[PDB]
């Protein structure tokens, strides 16, 4: 059912995450971490302290799909044992140095074809697939998350318990 998920998404903020590779999304799905560039790192830290939930919705460049969505459980943190991201051409480990802990809500794919009817008012009313770090307005982001199939590998309890 959607009661639990709708509870997690009440008053949530939503950010699109655009990964240049599949590897870092596979890594992040298993380990429960994400890192972004400093502009977006600042944006997500502000949203984390301000919002009841901060949702990252992931799409790998050129994949034609979203790969899942997750909720921040921490602000970014530097100084931990380093995540061995596959670094894109012009990116250093220092640029991805802040590590957010995330709890995945769905790790299943949603093709762009299934979200063609949703537009983001905060990106000029363009389809929500169009947009790293683009903020998605509350209702559009909620409906986008609701489109994903249920994920039998996920237990929402840990998220609901830490809210």
């Amino acid at each position: 059912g959607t009661s639990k998920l709708k509870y997690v998404l009440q008053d949530a903020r939503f950010f699109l995450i655009k990964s240049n590779n599949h590897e870092n999304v596979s890594l992040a799905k298993a380990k429960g971490v994400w890192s972004t560039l400093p502009v977006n790192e600042k944006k997500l830290n502000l949203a984390f302290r301000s919002a009841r939930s901060v949702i990252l919705i992931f799409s790998v460049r050129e994949s034609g799909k979203f790969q899942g969505f997750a909720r921040l459980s921490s602000e970014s943190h530097h100084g931990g044992s380093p995540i061995h991201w596959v670094l894109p051409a012009g990116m250093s480990a220092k640029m991805l140095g802040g590590v957010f802990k995330i709890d995945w809500i769905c790790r299943r794919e949603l093709p762009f074809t299934k979200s063609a009817h949703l537009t983001n008012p905060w990106n000029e009313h363009k389809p929500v697939k169009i947009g790293d770090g683009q903020e998605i307005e509350l209702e559009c982001g909620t409906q986008l998350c609701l489109l994903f199939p249920p994920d039998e590998s996920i237990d929402l309890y840990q998220v609901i318990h830490k809210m």
Side-chain angles (χ1 to χ4, degrees), residues 19-25 27 34-37 82-83 85-93 95-98:
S19 180
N20 278 0
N21 54 62
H22 278 287
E23 295 102 297
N24 289 350
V25 176
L27 188 166
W34 191 244
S35 296
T36 189
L37 289 202
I83 308 298
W85 300 117
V86 165
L87 298 176
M91 302 204 33
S92 36
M95 278 148 68
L96 290 178

PDB file of all heavy atoms in Angstrom, residues 19-25 27 34-37 82-98, unseen atoms left out:
ATOM      1  N   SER A  19      23.657  10.929 -12.579  1.00  0.00           N
ATOM      2  CA  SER A  19      24.961  10.288 -12.530  1.00  0.00           C
ATOM      3  C   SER A  19      25.519  10.076 -13.933  1.00  0.00           C
ATOM      4  O   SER A  19      24.814   9.639 -14.844  1.00  0.00           O
ATOM      5  CB  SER A  19      24.872   8.949 -11.791  1.00  0.00           C
ATOM      6  OG  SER A  19      26.144   8.317 -11.749  1.00  0.00           O
ATOM      7  N   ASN A  20      26.801  10.388 -14.096  1.00  0.00           N
ATOM      8  CA  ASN A  20      27.417  10.155 -15.393  1.00  0.00           C
ATOM      9  C   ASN A  20      27.674   8.678 -15.672  1.00  0.00           C
ATOM     10  O   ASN A  20      27.880   8.313 -16.835  1.00  0.00           O
ATOM     11  CB  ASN A  20      28.691  10.988 -15.547  1.00  0.00           C
ATOM     12  CG  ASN A  20      28.399  12.420 -15.956  1.00  0.00           C
ATOM     13  OD1 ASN A  20      27.243  12.808 -16.133  1.00  0.00           O
ATOM     14  ND2 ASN A  20      29.454  13.201 -16.148  1.00  0.00           N
ATOM     15  N   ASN A  21      27.642   7.810 -14.658  1.00  0.00           N
ATOM     16  CA  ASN A  21      27.913   6.397 -14.892  1.00  0.00           C
ATOM     17  C   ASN A  21      26.948   5.531 -14.092  1.00  0.00           C
ATOM     18  O   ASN A  21      26.311   5.983 -13.138  1.00  0.00           O
ATOM     19  CB  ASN A  21      29.375   6.006 -14.589  1.00  0.00           C
ATOM     20  CG  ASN A  21      29.818   6.406 -13.200  1.00  0.00           C
ATOM     21  OD1 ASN A  21      29.274   5.937 -12.197  1.00  0.00           O
ATOM     22  ND2 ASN A  21      30.827   7.260 -13.126  1.00  0.00           N
ATOM     23  N   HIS A  22      26.831   4.272 -14.522  1.00  0.00           N
ATOM     24  CA  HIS A  22      26.022   3.306 -13.785  1.00  0.00           C
ATOM     25  C   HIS A  22      26.743   2.802 -12.542  1.00  0.00           C
ATOM     26  O   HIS A  22      26.096   2.452 -11.548  1.00  0.00           O
ATOM     27  CB  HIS A  22      25.661   2.127 -14.689  1.00  0.00           C
ATOM     28  CG  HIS A  22      24.490   2.381 -15.587  1.00  0.00           C
ATOM     29  ND1 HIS A  22      23.190   2.429 -15.125  1.00  0.00           N
ATOM     30  CD2 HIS A  22      24.420   2.574 -16.924  1.00  0.00           C
ATOM     31  CE1 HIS A  22      22.374   2.655 -16.139  1.00  0.00           C
ATOM     32  NE2 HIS A  22      23.095   2.750 -17.242  1.00  0.00           N
ATOM     33  N   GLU A  23      28.078   2.766 -12.570  1.00  0.00           N
ATOM     34  CA  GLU A  23      28.831   2.158 -11.479  1.00  0.00           C
ATOM     35  C   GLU A  23      28.549   2.849 -10.153  1.00  0.00           C
ATOM     36  O   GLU A  23      28.319   2.192  -9.134  1.00  0.00           O
ATOM     37  CB  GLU A  23      30.327   2.181 -11.799  1.00  0.00           C
ATOM     38  CG  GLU A  23      30.700   1.325 -13.001  1.00  0.00           C
ATOM     39  CD  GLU A  23      30.933   2.149 -14.244  1.00  0.00           C
ATOM     40  OE1 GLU A  23      29.979   2.803 -14.699  1.00  0.00           O
ATOM     41  OE2 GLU A  23      32.071   2.141 -14.769  1.00  0.00           O
ATOM     42  N   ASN A  24      28.550   4.182 -10.140  1.00  0.00           N
ATOM     43  CA  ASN A  24      28.395   4.873  -8.866  1.00  0.00           C
ATOM     44  C   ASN A  24      26.993   4.702  -8.305  1.00  0.00           C
ATOM     45  O   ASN A  24      26.815   4.721  -7.082  1.00  0.00           O
ATOM     46  CB  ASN A  24      28.752   6.350  -9.017  1.00  0.00           C
ATOM     47  CG  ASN A  24      30.237   6.551  -9.218  1.00  0.00           C
ATOM     48  OD1 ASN A  24      31.011   5.613  -9.065  1.00  0.00           O
ATOM     49  ND2 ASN A  24      30.642   7.770  -9.578  1.00  0.00           N
ATOM     50  N   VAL A  25      25.999   4.539  -9.179  1.00  0.00           N
ATOM     51  CA  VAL A  25      24.654   4.240  -8.705  1.00  0.00           C
ATOM     52  C   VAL A  25      24.588   2.827  -8.133  1.00  0.00           C
ATOM     53  O   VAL A  25      23.964   2.599  -7.095  1.00  0.00           O
ATOM     54  CB  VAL A  25      23.609   4.500  -9.801  1.00  0.00           C
ATOM     55  CG1 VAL A  25      22.216   4.090  -9.326  1.00  0.00           C
ATOM     56  CG2 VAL A  25      23.583   5.977 -10.161  1.00  0.00           C
ATOM     57  N   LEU A  27      27.081   1.223  -6.760  1.00  0.00           N
ATOM     58  CA  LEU A  27      27.780   1.323  -5.486  1.00  0.00           C
ATOM     59  C   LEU A  27      26.877   1.931  -4.426  1.00  0.00           C
ATOM     60  O   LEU A  27      26.737   1.397  -3.320  1.00  0.00           O
ATOM     61  CB  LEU A  27      29.039   2.176  -5.689  1.00  0.00           C
ATOM     62  CG  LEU A  27      30.095   2.334  -4.592  1.00  0.00           C
ATOM     63  CD1 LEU A  27      31.365   2.927  -5.186  1.00  0.00           C
ATOM     64  CD2 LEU A  27      29.638   3.171  -3.399  1.00  0.00           C
ATOM     65  N   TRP A  34      25.835   8.689  -0.926  1.00  0.00           N
ATOM     66  CA  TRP A  34      25.968   9.458  -2.151  1.00  0.00           C
ATOM     67  C   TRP A  34      26.887  10.649  -1.910  1.00  0.00           C
ATOM     68  O   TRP A  34      26.996  11.153  -0.788  1.00  0.00           O
ATOM     69  CB  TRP A  34      24.612   9.959  -2.666  1.00  0.00           C
ATOM     70  CG  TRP A  34      24.718  10.520  -4.050  1.00  0.00           C
ATOM     71  CD1 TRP A  34      24.501  11.828  -4.450  1.00  0.00           C
ATOM     72  CD2 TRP A  34      25.083   9.806  -5.234  1.00  0.00           C
ATOM     73  NE1 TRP A  34      24.708  11.946  -5.799  1.00  0.00           N
ATOM     74  CE2 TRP A  34      25.072  10.725  -6.304  1.00  0.00           C
ATOM     75  CE3 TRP A  34      25.423   8.473  -5.493  1.00  0.00           C
ATOM     76  CZ2 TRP A  34      25.367  10.351  -7.607  1.00  0.00           C
ATOM     77  CZ3 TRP A  34      25.725   8.106  -6.785  1.00  0.00           C
ATOM     78  CH2 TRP A  34      25.715   9.044  -7.828  1.00  0.00           C
ATOM     79  N   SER A  35      27.541  11.087  -2.980  1.00  0.00           N
ATOM     80  CA  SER A  35      28.346  12.298  -2.994  1.00  0.00           C
ATOM     81  C   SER A  35      28.013  13.066  -4.259  1.00  0.00           C
ATOM     82  O   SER A  35      27.787  12.468  -5.318  1.00  0.00           O
ATOM     83  CB  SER A  35      29.851  11.958  -2.987  1.00  0.00           C
ATOM     84  OG  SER A  35      30.194  11.293  -1.784  1.00  0.00           O
ATOM     85  N   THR A  36      27.995  14.396  -4.152  1.00  0.00           N
ATOM     86  CA  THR A  36      27.757  15.281  -5.283  1.00  0.00           C
ATOM     87  C   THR A  36      28.787  16.409  -5.265  1.00  0.00           C
ATOM     88  O   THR A  36      29.641  16.481  -4.376  1.00  0.00           O
ATOM     89  CB  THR A  36      26.306  15.798  -5.281  1.00  0.00           C
ATOM     90  OG1 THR A  36      26.029  16.493  -6.504  1.00  0.00           O
ATOM     91  CG2 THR A  36      26.051  16.714  -4.102  1.00  0.00           C
ATOM     92  N   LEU A  37      28.703  17.289  -6.259  1.00  0.00           N
ATOM     93  CA  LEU A  37      29.611  18.423  -6.385  1.00  0.00           C
ATOM     94  C   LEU A  37      29.272  19.507  -5.363  1.00  0.00           C
ATOM     95  O   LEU A  37      28.164  19.545  -4.828  1.00  0.00           O
ATOM     96  CB  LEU A  37      29.556  18.966  -7.806  1.00  0.00           C
ATOM     97  CG  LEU A  37      30.201  18.046  -8.841  1.00  0.00           C
ATOM     98  CD1 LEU A  37      30.601  18.819 -10.090  1.00  0.00           C
ATOM     99  CD2 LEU A  37      31.403  17.331  -8.247  1.00  0.00           C
ATOM    100  N   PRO A  82      37.429   6.412   2.588  1.00  0.00           N
ATOM    101  CA  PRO A  82      36.987   6.993   1.311  1.00  0.00           C
ATOM    102  C   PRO A  82      36.145   6.031   0.482  1.00  0.00           C
ATOM    103  O   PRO A  82      36.489   4.858   0.314  1.00  0.00           O
ATOM    104  CB  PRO A  82      38.303   7.337   0.604  1.00  0.00           C
ATOM    105  CG  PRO A  82      39.312   6.428   1.216  1.00  0.00           C
ATOM    106  CD  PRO A  82      38.886   6.212   2.639  1.00  0.00           C
ATOM    107  N   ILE A  83      35.037   6.549  -0.047  1.00  0.00           N
ATOM    108  CA  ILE A  83      34.272   5.822  -1.048  1.00  0.00           C
ATOM    109  C   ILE A  83      35.040   5.854  -2.360  1.00  0.00           C
ATOM    110  O   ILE A  83      35.494   6.915  -2.808  1.00  0.00           O
ATOM    111  CB  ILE A  83      32.884   6.457  -1.222  1.00  0.00           C
ATOM    112  CG1 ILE A  83      32.168   6.606   0.119  1.00  0.00           C
ATOM    113  CG2 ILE A  83      32.047   5.636  -2.191  1.00  0.00           C
ATOM    114  CD1 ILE A  83      31.890   5.289   0.818  1.00  0.00           C
ATOM    115  N   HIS A  84      35.160   4.696  -3.000  1.00  0.00           N
ATOM    116  CA  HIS A  84      35.949   4.569  -4.223  1.00  0.00           C
ATOM    117  C   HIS A  84      35.061   4.726  -5.459  1.00  0.00           C
ATOM    118  O   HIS A  84      34.913   3.817  -6.276  1.00  0.00           O
ATOM    119  CB  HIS A  84      36.694   3.239  -4.237  1.00  0.00           C
ATOM    120  N   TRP A  85      34.465   5.916  -5.576  1.00  0.00           N
ATOM    121  CA  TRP A  85      33.652   6.242  -6.738  1.00  0.00           C
ATOM    122  C   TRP A  85      34.443   6.031  -8.021  1.00  0.00           C
ATOM    123  O   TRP A  85      35.661   6.224  -8.064  1.00  0.00           O
ATOM    124  CB  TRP A  85      33.240   7.714  -6.687  1.00  0.00           C
ATOM    125  CG  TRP A  85      32.433   8.105  -5.500  1.00  0.00           C
ATOM    126  CD1 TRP A  85      32.779   8.988  -4.525  1.00  0.00           C
ATOM    127  CD2 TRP A  85      31.116   7.648  -5.178  1.00  0.00           C
ATOM    128  NE1 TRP A  85      31.768   9.103  -3.605  1.00  0.00           N
ATOM    129  CE2 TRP A  85      30.737   8.283  -3.979  1.00  0.00           C
ATOM    130  CE3 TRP A  85      30.238   6.742  -5.771  1.00  0.00           C
ATOM    131  CZ2 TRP A  85      29.504   8.065  -3.379  1.00  0.00           C
ATOM    132  CZ3 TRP A  85      29.008   6.528  -5.170  1.00  0.00           C
ATOM    133  CH2 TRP A  85      28.661   7.176  -3.982  1.00  0.00           C
ATOM    134  N   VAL A  86      33.740   5.619  -9.072  1.00  0.00           N
ATOM    135  CA  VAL A  86      34.288   5.720 -10.419  1.00  0.00           C
ATOM    136  C   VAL A  86      34.233   7.194 -10.797  1.00  0.00           C
ATOM    137  O   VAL A  86      33.147   7.766 -10.926  1.00  0.00           O
ATOM    138  CB  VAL A  86      33.507   4.853 -11.413  1.00  0.00           C
ATOM    139  CG1 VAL A  86      33.834   5.246 -12.842  1.00  0.00           C
ATOM    140  CG2 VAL A  86      33.808   3.385 -11.187  1.00  0.00           C
ATOM    141  N   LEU A  87      35.399   7.827 -10.941  1.00  0.00           N
ATOM    142  CA  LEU A  87      35.391   9.280 -11.104  1.00  0.00           C
ATOM    143  C   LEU A  87      35.295   9.646 -12.578  1.00  0.00           C
ATOM    144  O   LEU A  87      36.120   9.185 -13.378  1.00  0.00           O
ATOM    145  CB  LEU A  87      36.660   9.894 -10.525  1.00  0.00           C
ATOM    146  CG  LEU A  87      36.913   9.705  -9.029  1.00  0.00           C
ATOM    147  CD1 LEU A  87      38.272  10.287  -8.663  1.00  0.00           C
ATOM    148  CD2 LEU A  87      35.814  10.341  -8.185  1.00  0.00           C
ATOM    149  N   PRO A  88      34.318  10.464 -12.966  1.00  0.00           N
ATOM    150  CA  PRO A  88      34.241  10.923 -14.358  1.00  0.00           C
ATOM    151  C   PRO A  88      35.468  11.736 -14.746  1.00  0.00           C
ATOM    152  O   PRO A  88      36.225  12.214 -13.898  1.00  0.00           O
ATOM    153  CB  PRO A  88      32.973  11.786 -14.385  1.00  0.00           C
ATOM    154  CG  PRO A  88      32.153  11.293 -13.217  1.00  0.00           C
ATOM    155  CD  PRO A  88      33.142  10.873 -12.173  1.00  0.00           C
ATOM    156  N   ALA A  89      35.631  11.897 -16.065  1.00  0.00           N
ATOM    157  CA  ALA A  89      36.825  12.474 -16.681  1.00  0.00           C
ATOM    158  C   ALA A  89      37.433  13.629 -15.893  1.00  0.00           C
ATOM    159  O   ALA A  89      38.597  13.571 -15.482  1.00  0.00           O
ATOM    160  CB  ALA A  89      36.501  12.913 -18.115  1.00  0.00           C
ATOM    161  N   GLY A  90      36.662  14.689 -15.672  1.00  0.00           N
ATOM    162  CA  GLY A  90      37.218  15.856 -15.015  1.00  0.00           C
ATOM    163  C   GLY A  90      36.787  16.020 -13.573  1.00  0.00           C
ATOM    164  O   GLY A  90      36.348  17.103 -13.174  1.00  0.00           O
ATOM    165  N   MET A  91      36.910  14.956 -12.778  1.00  0.00           N
ATOM    166  CA  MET A  91      36.463  14.970 -11.392  1.00  0.00           C
ATOM    167  C   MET A  91      37.504  14.302 -10.507  1.00  0.00           C
ATOM    168  O   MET A  91      38.050  13.252 -10.860  1.00  0.00           O
ATOM    169  CB  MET A  91      35.132  14.224 -11.235  1.00  0.00           C
ATOM    170  CG  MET A  91      33.997  14.757 -12.090  1.00  0.00           C
ATOM    171  SD  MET A  91      32.394  14.350 -11.376  1.00  0.00           S
ATOM    172  CE  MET A  91      32.814  14.414  -9.642  1.00  0.00           C
ATOM    173  N   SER A  92      37.761  14.906  -9.353  1.00  0.00           N
ATOM    174  CA  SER A  92      38.707  14.388  -8.377  1.00  0.00           C
ATOM    175  C   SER A  92      37.962  13.908  -7.140  1.00  0.00           C
ATOM    176  O   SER A  92      36.799  14.251  -6.915  1.00  0.00           O
ATOM    177  CB  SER A  92      39.707  15.473  -7.970  1.00  0.00           C
ATOM    178  OG  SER A  92      39.072  16.741  -7.932  1.00  0.00           O
ATOM    179  N   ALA A  93      38.656  13.103  -6.333  1.00  0.00           N
ATOM    180  CA  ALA A  93      38.066  12.611  -5.094  1.00  0.00           C
ATOM    181  C   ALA A  93      37.696  13.754  -4.158  1.00  0.00           C
ATOM    182  O   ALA A  93      36.713  13.654  -3.417  1.00  0.00           O
ATOM    183  CB  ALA A  93      39.026  11.645  -4.400  1.00  0.00           C
ATOM    184  N   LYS A  94      38.464  14.848  -4.185  1.00  0.00           N
ATOM    185  CA  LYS A  94      38.162  15.988  -3.324  1.00  0.00           C
ATOM    186  C   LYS A  94      36.842  16.650  -3.703  1.00  0.00           C
ATOM    187  O   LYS A  94      36.141  17.167  -2.826  1.00  0.00           O
ATOM    188  CB  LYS A  94      39.304  17.007  -3.374  1.00  0.00           C
ATOM    189  N   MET A  95      36.490  16.652  -4.991  1.00  0.00           N
ATOM    190  CA  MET A  95      35.218  17.239  -5.406  1.00  0.00           C
ATOM    191  C   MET A  95      34.029  16.415  -4.925  1.00  0.00           C
ATOM    192  O   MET A  95      32.948  16.970  -4.694  1.00  0.00           O
ATOM    193  CB  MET A  95      35.176  17.414  -6.924  1.00  0.00           C
ATOM    194  CG  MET A  95      35.882  18.663  -7.423  1.00  0.00           C
ATOM    195  SD  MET A  95      36.625  18.449  -9.049  1.00  0.00           S
ATOM    196  CE  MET A  95      35.172  18.299 -10.078  1.00  0.00           C
ATOM    197  N   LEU A  96      34.204  15.102  -4.765  1.00  0.00           N
ATOM    198  CA  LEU A  96      33.172  14.221  -4.229  1.00  0.00           C
ATOM    199  C   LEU A  96      33.421  13.859  -2.768  1.00  0.00           C
ATOM    200  O   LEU A  96      32.985  12.797  -2.308  1.00  0.00           O
ATOM    201  CB  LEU A  96      33.053  12.952  -5.072  1.00  0.00           C
ATOM    202  CG  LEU A  96      32.476  13.103  -6.474  1.00  0.00           C
ATOM    203  CD1 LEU A  96      32.463  11.761  -7.200  1.00  0.00           C
ATOM    204  CD2 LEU A  96      31.077  13.709  -6.441  1.00  0.00           C
ATOM    205  N   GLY A  97      34.104  14.736  -2.024  1.00  0.00           N
ATOM    206  CA  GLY A  97      34.557  14.384  -0.689  1.00  0.00           C
ATOM    207  C   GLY A  97      33.472  14.316   0.365  1.00  0.00           C
ATOM    208  O   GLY A  97      33.598  13.557   1.333  1.00  0.00           O
ATOM    209  N   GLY A  98      32.408  15.104   0.218  1.00  0.00           N
ATOM    210  CA  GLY A  98      31.312  15.050   1.173  1.00  0.00           C
ATOM    211  C   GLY A  98      30.451  13.823   0.923  1.00  0.00           C
ATOM    212  O   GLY A  98      30.021  13.573  -0.209  1.00  0.00           O
TER     213      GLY A  98
END
